[PDB]
Amino acid sequence: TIWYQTNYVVPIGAPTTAYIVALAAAQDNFTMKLCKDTEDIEQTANIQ
Amino acid sequence: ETILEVNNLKTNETTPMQRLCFPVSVQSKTGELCAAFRADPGRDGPWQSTILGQLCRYYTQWSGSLEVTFMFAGSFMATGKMLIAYTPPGGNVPADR
Amino acid sequence: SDRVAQLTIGNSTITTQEAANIVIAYGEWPEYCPDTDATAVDKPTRPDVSVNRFFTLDTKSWAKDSKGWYWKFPDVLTEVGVFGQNAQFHYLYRSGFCVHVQCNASKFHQGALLVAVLPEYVLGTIAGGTGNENSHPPYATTQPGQVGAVLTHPYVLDAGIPLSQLTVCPHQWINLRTNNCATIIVPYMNTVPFDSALNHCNFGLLVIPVVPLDFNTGATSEIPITVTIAPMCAEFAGLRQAVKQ
Amino acid sequence: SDRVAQLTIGNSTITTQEAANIVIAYGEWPEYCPDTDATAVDKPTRPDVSVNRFFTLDTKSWAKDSKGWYWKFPDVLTEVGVFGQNAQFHYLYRSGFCVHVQCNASKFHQGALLVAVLPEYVLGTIAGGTGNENSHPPYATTQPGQVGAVLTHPYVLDAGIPLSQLTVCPHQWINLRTNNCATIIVPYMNTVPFDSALNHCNFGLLVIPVVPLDFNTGATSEIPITVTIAPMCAEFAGLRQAVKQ
Amino acid sequence: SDRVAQLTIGNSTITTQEAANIVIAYGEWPEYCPDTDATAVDKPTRPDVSVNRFFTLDTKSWAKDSKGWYWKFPDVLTEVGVFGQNAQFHYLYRSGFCVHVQCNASKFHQGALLVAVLPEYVLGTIAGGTGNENSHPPYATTQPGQVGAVLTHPYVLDAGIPLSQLTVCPHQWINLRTNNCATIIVPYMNTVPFDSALNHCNFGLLVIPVVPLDFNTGATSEIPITVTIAPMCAEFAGLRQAVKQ
Amino acid sequence: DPIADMIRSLTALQVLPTAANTEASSHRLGTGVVPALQAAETGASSNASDKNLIETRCVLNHHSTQETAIGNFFSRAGLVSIITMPTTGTQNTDGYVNWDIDLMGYAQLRRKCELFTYMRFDAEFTFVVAKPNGELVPQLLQYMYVPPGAPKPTSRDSFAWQTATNPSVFVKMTDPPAQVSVPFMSPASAYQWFYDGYPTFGEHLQANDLDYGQCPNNMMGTFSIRTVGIEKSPHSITLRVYMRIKHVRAWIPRPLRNQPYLFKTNPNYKGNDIKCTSTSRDKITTL
Amino acid sequence: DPIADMIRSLTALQVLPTAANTEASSHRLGTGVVPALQAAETGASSNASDKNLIETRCVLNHHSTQETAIGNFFSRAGLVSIITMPTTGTQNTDGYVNWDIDLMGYAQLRRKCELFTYMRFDAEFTFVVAKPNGELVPQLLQYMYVPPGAPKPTSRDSFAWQTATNPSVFVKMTDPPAQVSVPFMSPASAYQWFYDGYPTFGEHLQANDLDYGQCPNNMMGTFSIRTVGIEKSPHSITLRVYMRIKHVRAWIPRPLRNQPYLFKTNPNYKGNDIKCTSTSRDKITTL
Amino acid sequence: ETGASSNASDKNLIETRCVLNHHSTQETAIGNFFSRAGLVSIITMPTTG
Numbered sequence A: 001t002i003w004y005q006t007n008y009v010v011p012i013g014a015p016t017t018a019y020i021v022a023l024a025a026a027q028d029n030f031t032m033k034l035c036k037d038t039e040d041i042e043q044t045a046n047i048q
Numbered sequence B: 001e002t003i004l005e006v007n008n009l010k011t012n013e014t015t016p017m018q019r020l021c022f023p024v025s026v027q028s029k030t031g032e033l034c035a036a037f038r039a040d041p042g043r044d045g046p047w048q049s050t051i052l053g054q055l056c057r058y059y060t061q062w063s064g065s066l067e068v069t070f071m072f073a074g075s076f077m078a079t080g081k082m083l084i085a086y087t088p089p090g091g092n093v094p095a096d097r
Numbered sequence C, D, E: 001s002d003r004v005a006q007l008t009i010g011n012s013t014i015t016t017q018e019a020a021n022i023v024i025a026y027g028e029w030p031e032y033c034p035d036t037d038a039t040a041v042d043k044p045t046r047p048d049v050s051v052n053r054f055f056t057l058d059t060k061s062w063a064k065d066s067k068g069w070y071w072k073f074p075d076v077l078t079e080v081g082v083f084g085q086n087a088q089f090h091y092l093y094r095s096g097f098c099v100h101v102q103c104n105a106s107k108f109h110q111g112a113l114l115v116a117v118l119p120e121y122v123l124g125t126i127a128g129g130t131g132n133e134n135s136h137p138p139y140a141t142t143q144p145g146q147v148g149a150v151l152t153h154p155y156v157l158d159a160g161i162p163l164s165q166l167t168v169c170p171h172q173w174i175n176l177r178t179n180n181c182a183t184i185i186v187p188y189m190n191t192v193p194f195d196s197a198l199n200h201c202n203f204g205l206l207v208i209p210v211v212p213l214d215f216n217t218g219a220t221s222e223i224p225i226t227v228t229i230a231p232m233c234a235e236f237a238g239l240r241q242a243v244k245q
Numbered sequence F, G: 001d002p003i004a005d006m007i008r009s010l011t012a013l014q015v016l017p018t019a020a021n022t023e024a025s026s027h028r029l030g031t032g033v034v035p036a037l038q039a040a041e042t043g044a045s046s047n048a049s050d051k052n053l054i055e056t057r058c059v060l061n062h063h064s065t066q067e068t069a070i071g072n073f074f075s076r077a078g079l080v081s082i083i084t085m086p087t088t089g090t091q092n093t094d095g096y097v098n099w100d101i102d103l104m105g106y107a108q109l110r111r112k113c114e115l116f117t118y119m120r121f122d123a124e125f126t127f128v129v130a131k132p133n134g135e136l137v138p139q140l141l142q143y144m145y146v147p148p149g150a151p152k153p154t155s156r157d158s159f160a161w162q163t164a165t166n167p168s169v170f171v172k173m174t175d176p177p178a179q180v181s182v183p184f185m186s187p188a189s190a191y192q193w194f195y196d197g198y199p200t201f202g203e204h205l206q207a208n209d210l211d212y213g214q215c216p217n218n219m220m221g222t223f224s225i226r227t228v229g230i231e232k233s234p235h236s237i238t239l240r241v242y243m244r245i246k247h248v249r250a251w252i253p254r255p256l257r258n259q260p261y262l263f264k265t266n267p268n269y270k271g272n273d274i275k276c277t278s279t280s281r282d283k284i285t286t287l
Numbered sequence H: 001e002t003g004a005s006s007n008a009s010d011k012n013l014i015e016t017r018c019v020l021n022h023h024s025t026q027e028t029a030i031g032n033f034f035s036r037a038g039l040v041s042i043i044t045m046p047t048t049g
């Protein structure tokens, strides 16, 4: 969860709305196991 | 690190680029919630956009600590303090800050 | 390299890129009570990370006409997380604190808050105005809880003493053009080694705008002030059932 | 010198002048989780004396026709004292237990209770009698809280297994003509190093009268049974807000 | 001391007072092809300073609604200066690159460009919308020359792949409130030691505004983006007459 | 330093290849010593042995204890599943079947495993297939393991059978039975036949009391099978799956099931007909 | 061992008998060094000294710092109480008086003590007695200390004056003034002029808000006095009590009282007339 | 903006215990990820059509 600790403050002359980009990754103690097929790809139809 | 789609709204689907970043803006009330999402990396949601998420979907189990880095892209004249929290299992989305 | 800082304790971390050093009240770090000074014979419980961590209380809004606020310790946390629970279940308590007050604006705003710690902050009443009435402050004023309270007469700190001399106490200033936070580390101070977290407030935290907030219209007007505190070396003794007051 | 005993832990002490030794389940003393076995990376909180102490639950009354009772761990304490509070505020929990069941009568009464600890005590239903209904036990039956529950079919431990073989588990007997208490020390047993104190009950404590209570009329008829338990090496991790279930 | 920088190669020098370090793609500096890996037997020509220098291409204008651009290498320079001439007169070419993308605004503007290098950037078509038409990109789209081209569907990089994962490639960001340029040093990458500078583009440079440009009206609205690149360790072989394609 | 207060298992393993010997003993007549008297209340079993209660001869016992090592008790292939793909009927005229892996459907093996609370092991799976009457025909089959989260095939020719990452086995009904080794796959340190708890947080309303006792750490996914072909096969198929535990470790023994099994996922028993563990007789004084 | 995770003050005292000396300095012209510039936000006071801002001569300063040692500041007898026993009126025609010990009734001494939060010390009490007009007569008096819990005399001849255990002093109004030494008596380690709390648990209803700020650790009991005799004395008596702090230690300095005192037990001030700490003038640009 | 991923680890953001991690990294070696037979072609030779 991301909360406003104080407030987004800006002076006269600058946008009152801005954006944040979130990047994610694994740390050094990360490992995976039991290789399997992904749900994220499907051959809905024939590839010509 | 790869980009997390925190702003994965149904209203975004036709302007997908808008999903790559979420907003912050001058609040009128204190302690407002800015955004929320699950940390589950192999689950459907924001993590699916990351190379991490896609790859761990080729494995049944995982273990380890994750890391999310937030980059602020407002103007140089903008200032602010945000509280980012990770709530381990048990409690649904915290009601308030 | 003195303007940047990170505070990590328990499962919590604070960052700031516009600090102005850190104050260690009276030059002493908090510490657990030593056997020479102790008197109570039961082995205390020292929960560590479940209670020595950062807690963020309700935020206040700074206006061009704000008088100033104050909070009492340990009152603010008697009902928050595991710390509060321990304070309720035990007769005896003792700890130090790391106080971090936050307030950021823009390079076009101005103002200055004085952030101070005043041991044994006893409040007084205006005595019915004329001074013939020996009135007293109600519980809600002496122990305002986590919401804190508002000063009615900051100039005399609602206690017949000059704000002008409060700097004789551990403090820092949040001067908008310079920094956006104040950090003060406070050691346990009392005439007894342990005490009740309910009946006695060791010190008060005052945040007073000595130089009023100002800015040209059009600039962001919601300028909050947030208080985040962390007990340090929290110790408890005299276990029994839970008591709220 | 084996019949007399004292148990002191935390701010609590138990005495007995008619014991029958003490059982250490599977020959192992409870211990904190070691770094080789651990997996969660956060530094845990080990409250010590505020949670590793004796708690006495509600007393039950033994009648000439009682079927027997059971309690689940750590369910019994999830809402008692500082232990419960820690169990609620943390996702992860782990501990061992010292179980002390009390029951005294007179040299003229008779009867024998079997006091046992059964790891992963999963309950079953009578399947609608005929066995065609796949019914399940309601929360109140699987996690009866500190009041415990009553066995409806002790002979099969409400789980399709023979009471006759329960002695294969850590146990003692309270045979009125011999002793007046049972003491069992239980180490943490699970397939994971830490777990939820709310979703998973590590073991169940069963107290079943295998040889029914009897006495000539005129003798005291109120023969209670009291359960006093103490967590040992309680450790917690994954701090967040409090959750009751 | 990491924000300031100077790049001098050939008769050209670049300066920047708001950098954010420099990236060395896959951790490798460009280098001439070694005798173990080489296969072509003719002694190559290594022009040095006449071709390993900075060339500045046409500037693009960043608007609140820009989709993003891309350039292909070595296409961009096949017709510029002595480098292009050498690329035309020789069958074989090989080199690395120093890519410097420039974009400055004011402390009151905002936005963020992702600057990345994608090896073997093969483009795809939208397949007639329905996907029943096996259409292909025209020369002008696959090899846009020094003017570069515009992405029609940045989200999938006009190639059925997620922009969200492009950071897995050598890159930097130009976040207006932080820096005003990106610098990436790219080594030769291919399955063959030398190749045609005309038929094969080793990699593509993408500049995509992931966080859109914004500013209050009244502020400068023409915010250009300029690309300056320098071949490094350019080598050529298989001399003959000049060929443009 | 300025605060003073801030500063195991009594039994282990032996190798016993043979039953204990019997030492010769003679008569013992005296006070104080009394080995025949015990106190079962302690929780301990009697320590008395033959030589203390009678006069014994010497016996050099060479009886082996090897066959009762848990490894030899469990490493015997047993039936854990019967899967059928008939050609006519409401069953599966589809030419494929997806089976949720649950081995608690057959009593013989189940009762043996439930003697323990936790078990960790590897396994050898053997797949015996034939027509329902036991005859064999030249039919090509494909068995595929679909771990939790992997797409389950939805038809005899679903893309999932491309099996690019999942492990698949292709065998003929005429070849001997297929056989493979499977490692220990739980995310926990051991499989557990009893889980006194719920899989998730929340209120446990009677509507979802079927959650009770369900341990995700034992849910290994799906086992899929199909006749390999784009057209339907004319043969009904019967697949029996056998499992052989190997490299096993076990913890916490418990009473053995003494009521017939009713369901794969719980210990429910028929309450109207509660069987006694032992047969009965008329009098306690007569055989 | 198998669990790794289970494994001060940067400033001290100096003796400064004399004020710091001034070392001679010359001109300093350069970049980088800038002692005149400070950052009061830090909470620290300026470190700049004369030699950094101007050219100084050398001055061997021998001014003593001794008179500002807290001991010399406090060890001066001050009035803490005036007790009267008149012969006619509603006051005390009884010949005796019981006074609850509370020294906060006189401003001069009180303001000095309130400069600190906690103080620990011994004290010398002097008792100056005379008729209300300052004249002296041959009257025998008895002063007695009645610690908390000791029976308070209820009359000029109550048994309590037997003073078998309490300490009493017998002196004539004509003798010099009686004087005694008193040790540090709080059950706490120090007397505290400010106690932000309540003495007991419970709800703190507005009915008992007079409890706020009352620290039992400072309540030393009663001081009783009487004319020594079974019959009433014909003389009105005026007793002034002076206290002299000695062997003192003090902690935590605080702002000095800047509003007149209203009550012995709290810091209440007259809100309609809040005095400014400094006098005023017309313009900030004129004296 | 540098192009680098964050270097922060658990111990820098929170108080950690010691954990002797023996989880293997072998199954994610590209060799084990790819060396699994997959379908690359289906060829048919019918008798009619």
Ligand SMILES: CCCCCCCCCCCCC/C=C\[C@H](O)[C@H](N)CO
Residues within 6 Å of the ligand: F101, F102, F103, F104, F123, F125, F143, F144, F145, F167, F168, F169, F180, F182, F191, F193, F215, F218, F219, F220, F223
């Ligand atoms: C290509 C052949 C694939 C064969 C794959 C078979 C995998 C089966 C692994 C054995 C897992 C042990 C059984 C675990 C849990 C029990 O079934 C539980 N009672 C289910 O709730």
Ligand SMILES: CCCCCCCCCCCCC/C=C\[C@H](O)[C@H](N)CO
Residues within 6 Å of the ligand: G101, G102, G103, G104, G123, G125, G143, G144, G145, G167, G168, G169, G180, G182, G191, G193, G215, G218, G219, G220, G223
């Ligand atoms: C025979 C002569 C007896 C004289 C005894 C005098 C004892 C007085 C001891 C001094 C105690 C210091 C004053 C302590 C506390 C303050 O009065 C508090 N403000 C009262 O609430």
Ligand SMILES: [Cl-]
Residues within 6 Å of the ligand: B040, B041, B042, B043
């Ligand atoms: Cl996941």
Ligand SMILES: [Cl-]
Residues within 6 Å of the ligand: C152, C153, C154, C155, C156
């Ligand atoms: Cl005021």
Ligand SMILES: [Cl-]
Residues within 6 Å of the ligand: D152, D153, D154, D155, D156
């Ligand atoms: Cl029964």
Ligand SMILES: [Cl-]
Residues within 6 Å of the ligand: B016, B017, E152, E153, E154, E155, E156
């Ligand atoms: Cl797009």
Ligand SMILES: [Cl-]
Residues within 6 Å of the ligand: F157, F161, F162, H039
């Ligand atoms: Cl296929």
Ligand SMILES: [Cl-]
Residues within 6 Å of the ligand: G157, G161, G162
């Ligand atoms: Cl007398």
Ligand SMILES: [K+]
Residues within 6 Å of the ligand: F018, F019, F020, F021, F060, F061, F062
């Ligand atoms: K033998």
Ligand SMILES: [K+]
Residues within 6 Å of the ligand: G018, G019, G020, G021, G060, G061, G062
């Ligand atoms: K001097």
Ligand code: NA
Residues within 6 Å of the ligand: F034, F035, F036, F037, F038
């Ligand atoms: Na014996």
Ligand code: NA
Residues within 6 Å of the ligand: G034, G035, G036, G037, G038
């Ligand atoms: Na300076």
